[PDB]
C-alpha positions in Angstrom: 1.8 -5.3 6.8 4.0 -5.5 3.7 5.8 -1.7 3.2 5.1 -2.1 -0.4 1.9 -2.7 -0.1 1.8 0.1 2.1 3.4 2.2 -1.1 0.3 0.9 -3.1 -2.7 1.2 -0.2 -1.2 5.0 -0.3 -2.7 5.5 -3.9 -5.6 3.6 -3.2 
């Protein structure tokens, strides 16, 4: 999976 989607999923 895509680390800065990862950075986003994290605030999600």
């Amino acid at each position: 999976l895509d680390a800065a989607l990862l950075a986003a999923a994290k605030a999600w």
